[PDB]
Subunit: 205 residues, 4 copies
């Protein structure tokens, strides 16, 4: 049994992406009889989704957790819902900047996360790690991937649960001095380990 965990390459002028750095130590790890496979996907509209679909079809996971950077957030956030819209504040890594276009034409307006998000947030908080449910994953490539994931799973393999977790800046990214919050890499990896284990052990909230 496989858990697929995805993250992104650096974007928006950054030299690092905490989502990828944080999941690297999880590769090959066992989660109660499931093993973790990681995959890096490009921060590019549509191309990102092609990488995602290819990874899902290759690994045939029972659980998919996609991870992204949410610079400025203070804590770990587990996303409640993905919406069917691209509205890019900045260009992606290939220079695309879609304004109010659908992620999937004629797809539904939204998909709820299929992860046990409350249980995950409570496990994190109980472990002394600040975490909360988020009601918006943005309208950039992270939400795009969350929506595409949930749509793909619903259309092909409905018993497979997918969802999204955002991590904050690493300290090295918050040095730029706009009074930005951070979380160490060590703490991020621990938080993701707990969140993934919790999602695996608990089918629903």
């Amino acid at each position: 049994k496989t858990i697929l965990v995805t993250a992104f390459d650096p974007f928006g002028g950054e030299a690092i992406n905490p989502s990828w750095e944080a999941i690297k130590p999880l590769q090959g790890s066992q989660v109660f009889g499931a093993n973790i496979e990681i995959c890096q996907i490009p921060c590019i509209f549509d191309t990102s989704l092609e990488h995602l679909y290819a990874a899902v079809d290759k690994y045939q996971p029972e659980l998919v957790i996609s991870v992204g950077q949410a610079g400025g957030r203070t804590n770990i956030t587990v996303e409640r819902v993905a919406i069917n819209i691209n509205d890019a504040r900045i260009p992606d890594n290939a220079g695309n900047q879609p304004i109010d276009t659908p992620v999937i034409v004629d797809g539904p307006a939204a998909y709820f996360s299929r992860l046990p998000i409350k249980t995950m947030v409570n496990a994190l908080n109980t472990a002394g790690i600040p975490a909360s449910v988020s009601q918006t994953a943005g309208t950039f490539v992270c939400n795009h991937v969350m929506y595409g994931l949930l749509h793909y799973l619903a259309q092909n393999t409905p018993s497979v649960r997918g969802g999204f977790i955002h991590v904050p800046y690493l300290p090295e990214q918050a040095v730029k001095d706009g009074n930005q919050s951070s979380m160490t890499l060590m703490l991020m990896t621990l938080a993701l380990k707990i969140a993934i284990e919790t999602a695996w052990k608990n089918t629903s909230d």
Copy 2:
């Protein structure tokens, strides 16, 4: 041959009902360090107006440090902050650990309005940033026991041992402290301790900005 010198690092007891103060937890691993020609000595100060200062004076007299760095917690701040200035006022929003809640009283009667930190604060902030640790200069240490101690420290050194440099550093909440409702930033204990190591070493090795 030459004498080892002494760096005194202080931190506080927990306050406002908390069970821990990360300022103390962060400096505990530094006790007994013999590094770059200096013995590091630490001391826990009660979070009580005036009594804190008596403990501070006793520690300075005991260790006869060539450098003093006092540490406190500033829950809500996003990074490590190095204080520019201590002001001669107490104005407590909550009571201290002895129940005192002074409103607009001097730290030292007829002392000057303020003391600038004598630490190389820009150099320290730059050393932290360069090491990948978020940090900034702060223009206010608050009006609670932390500012009280910063002021009392700088006044005591000025009056008694002017060549000794003192100052103050604030750490943010620990992650476990930020779990409560609210959008509060945090920094791990491990990162705090690393940041304090860098700050102390930089302060010791740089006489001015």
Copy 3:
């Protein structure tokens, strides 16, 4: 030919909630009562801050006034500006109880309704009209999970099922200065600025069919 009925814009706001004695959403739209713009008369309606009951009152108002445009207003304490909502989501998750003591946890607004409805208002044009008037405003991607989002969802669903040509959406106002006096560094906007902003937003929505 003669006595051609004017079109109608329905603007709703809420009762006070959360222990407040005032709701600026209602205070801000009161001056719009008995007004008209570009061939449409404005009708206002105050709805209870109660899950499900709020929706009952909304449906009754819509049926009564047969509006061609519906804009619902609520307070989002802590926001810095005027926000125009992009999307309503099919969930109730109450941080605090409503005015009747209900505190639903992760229940649908409408059972077996879609997961979301996008606002049908020209939200970018409304935001730009506010900004160019000198009034801070932004598009929001979340109306929360309390009664405001609940009403936005129910409105969009009701219109979709019954009168699909009718456009609806939601606008949040921040705290009034008096509400922000409590400790905690809260942002605010005066009632006068809120009323001006809603006037501009409503006029822009009525005159622009799309973004």
Copy 4:
């Protein structure tokens, strides 16, 4: 009996300064047996203080209140203390960007405001206007002026009380979509009116 109120001209890239806009309607109004006189001073280190020095020597005020813009603040703030340092994040209006230089060479490290700051904040809050005491007026031209003012009065006319009030952005300045707080001009002017009258009527705190 003249109450003196000062404000600044636009700085940074700004087109307007709320401090000046807010105090204009206050010109010539009486406050319990005193007149208000206003003066605009340039946002330039040292040059600012000369204009200030001239104005105090001209109207011979029993009360001086200087006002400035604190973009980002959510409320009206009354400054507790001025410090003897210039440390400019951006150049002033003449291109000067001093780094850690004294406001007055060999002046004391700081001067406390001589205004009844707690009474002023209480009066504002009671009027339904968010306000607080601030412990830092920055290290730009506003603090520079506050310090130079308090030094001047202490050296020449110790019975004359001086201090500083910061106003937030006007709404039109917060349009930039950087999530900035604001206060309308109407509210600022009322706040300043109340704060000034409170300062006048209450000699202590």
